């Protein structure tokens, strides 16, 4: 479904970021679009890439030069650990910084509220409020619950992304 | 060349482990042997792999694939005094595994560039390396940022297989 709408001749660049241990690597792997490749453009800055035909997913941790990899980004996936209540405030701050990058002003926002399987995970209502998504203007956004370990939610989120480019 | 020595017909499997943040991914990248590939064979277990001709490095974090292993590289953060005991415990666990009794051991005392780093004698001591019998081992200081020490360590590894 989403694969159909994303594939083509023109490069499709997706940025997936979030705090460490949000589940970003696990998501890449569960997509099955090919090998996860790690590069280190500078020491301490680990970048994971999955490239399949015209589609690129670029992943790194935030909250710990970036502007280079923002070129022609069409979507931001922001992954949050729904169970990490102590760092939701940090996640909000890093998301908002991403969102005032002019280079990516026309990128749509998909939020994965990940680790939905966990007994004290925040609800999608809670995650949406605490990330301040309602405050977003002039950008399409969606927040989608996910479990990156069984893959629940991932295709639903990507389907929305593909439909709204 | 440490590379030319490892090269040949016979498979050469190296296992590189250590605590998270020890410097293992940085070391792999510095080796320039090929793309680093991540797999997740089981939930929560991230494995990084570099394969070049007959040589494969397999990397994962311990703390917090043993068949035909010719060498174990253990990477320790020389500047992390609070966790070297945990590094010792995980190293000793691995060296007790039957499947790998025949593997030689290279220890990289990494992050040697940092001004407060433990000296090699102290790393050696706090890892209990001297207590290891019936295994060839070597401790080498390294800096993964600029490659200091890496070639020296790998050359010892290639020589002593
Ligand atoms: N329970 C649960 N654990 C998850 C989920 N997604 C990731 N994890 C675990 O959280 C840890 C961090 O995952 P990882 O993908 O490496 O996060 P990254 O640092 O953002 O790339 C790993 O142990 C994962 O197995 C999830 O949806 N549910
Ligand atoms: N100062 C210094 N920092 C290092 C060295 N090796 C790695 N690092 C840093 O330590 C952190 C963790 O290294 P990484 O390769 O990701 O460790 P891994 O978790 O064992 O794969 C990164 O911020 C690196 O920049 C080193 O030799 N010296
Ligand atoms: Mg990751
Ligand atoms: Mg690593």
Q: Which residue in the block uniquely carries the two structure tokens 């499709």?
A: A12
Geometric angle at alpha carbon B8, from B7 and B11, rounded to 5°: 95
> What single DSSP character describes residue B54?
T
Q: Please tell me if residue A46 touches chain B, with a CB cutoff of 8 Å.
A: yes
Tokens of A28: 């890449």
SS3 A157: helix
Max distance between CA atoms of chain B, in angstroms, equals 44
Mutational test site, ligand 2, from B26, B28, B110, max ligand atoms within 8 Å of CB? B26
Q: Which domains does chain B have, with CATH numbers?
A: 1-161 (3.40.50.300)
Whether residue A84 contacts residue A120, with contact meaning beta carbons closer than 8 Å, is answered with: no
Alpha-carbon distance of A30 to A79, in angstroms, equals 14
Beta strand pairing call for A55-61 and A73-81: unpaired
Way the structure was solved: X-ray
3-class DSSP state of B115: coil
A43: CB partners within 8 A, 6+ apart: B26, B144, B145
Are the CB atoms for B11 and B4 separated by under 8 Å? no
Please state whether beta strands A12-18 and A73-81 pair in parallel, antiparallel, or not at all (unpaired): parallel
Breaks (C-N over 2.5 A) in chain B follow: 64
- Give, to the nearest 10 degrees, the angle between helix A154-163 and helix A24-31: 80
Q: What is the resolution of this structure in A?
A: 1.8
Tell me how far apart the alpha carbons of residues B99 and B65 are, in angstroms, rounded to a whole number: 9
Our answer on whether the CB atom of B43 is closer than 6 Å to any ligand 1 atom is: yes
DSSP β-bridge partners for residue B67: none
Which residues share a beta bridge with A152? A147
A81 at B interface, C-beta within 8 A: no
Nearest residue to A54 (alpha-carbon basis) of A34, A40, A76, A38: A34
């Amino acid at each position: 479904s989403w694969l159909s709408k994303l594939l083509g001749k023109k490069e499709m660049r997706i940025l997936m970021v979030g705090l460490d241990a949000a589940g970003k690597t696990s998501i890449l792997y569960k997509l099955k679009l090919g090998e996860i490749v790690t590069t280190i453009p500078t020491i301490g800055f680990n970048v994971e890439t999955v490239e399949y035909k015209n589609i690129s997913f670029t992943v790194w941790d935030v909250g710990g030069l970036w502007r280079h990899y923002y070129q022609n980004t069409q979507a931001i996936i922001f992954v949050v650990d729904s169970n990490d209540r102590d760092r939701i405030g940090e996640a909000r701050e890093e998301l908002m910084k991403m969102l005032n990058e002019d280079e990516m002003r026309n990128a749509i926002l998909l939020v994965f509220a990940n680790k939905h399987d966990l007994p004290q995970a925040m609800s999608i209502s809670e995650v949406t409020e605490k990330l301040g998504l309602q405050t977003i203007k002039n950008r399409k956004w969606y927040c989608q619950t996910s479990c990156a370990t069984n893959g629940d939610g991932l295709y639903e989120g990507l389907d929305w992304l593909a439909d709204n480019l």
